[PDB]
Chains A and B, each alone.
Chain A
């Protein structure tokens, strides 16, 4: 036990759990999931007196399924997850998931060519989660062709700008509740070009942040036992927060 000293004490024994996940998605233009996984980690910040033996339980009777695991070299073999945490802040585990993942957003691209002069683009996004949860830091990136002379854009929500030097329309929305949908409409004006090879369209890209594990993971409990000191599990104050953030999250179109 060279990761936790002997005489630690706090009146007000408190712990904070961070469940951090990025969800990666590659999706066809028709909505077929081409590829998807979640990698996550649990960070624990604990202020607990003595030498507490903790037990971390989650909804993974496998109720979600974990493909892989790494633990802080403080957790013990079996069965459940057992340990005496370092004081303060540390990483409890890294994990990976691929099954029955929740895709917070569904991106629906629509692209009509109009003569050789113009591209009409409509993109719809749908919040796929409880209506009482709020997503934020939503960003949709629509690539535009090299020979783009300019862009018109309308959107009833958020704000959108063409950035030429980046060749993308960037759409920003502050927050969006689950079970909603939003449109963006763009008209892309084209310069004459080499009629040979077409536009090899990069996928439409997305960023967002949601207050839940897209893997579906829930902390069932964290239990503290310190056989010696007056305090017990019920004296401990416990908090959790879930942040699911987009990793690579693209929809071909």
Chain B
């Protein structure tokens, strides 16, 4: 499980 990204 990973690093988050901006939704957009």
Binding site for B on A (CB under 8 A): 16-18, 20, 209, 211, 219, 221-222, 238-243
Contact = CB atoms under 8 A, between A and B. Distances in A.
Question: For this complex, into which size category does the number of interface residues on chain B fall?
Answer: under 10
A110 B4 CA distance: 39
Contacts of A238: 6-8
Q: Which 10 A-B pairs have the closest CB atoms?
A: A238-B7, A239-B4, A243-B1, A241-B2, A241-B4, A240-B7, A211-B2, A243-B2, A240-B5, A16-B4
Contacts of B3: 241
B8 A18 contact: no
17 contacts: A16-B4, A17-B7, A20-B1, A209-B1, A221-B8, A238-B8, A239-B4, A239-B5, A239-B6, A239-B7, A240-B6, A240-B7, A241-B1, A241-B3, A241-B4, A241-B5, A243-B2
B1 to A, nearest CB: 5
A195 B6 CA distance: 61
Contacts of A17: 7
Contacts of A221: 7-8
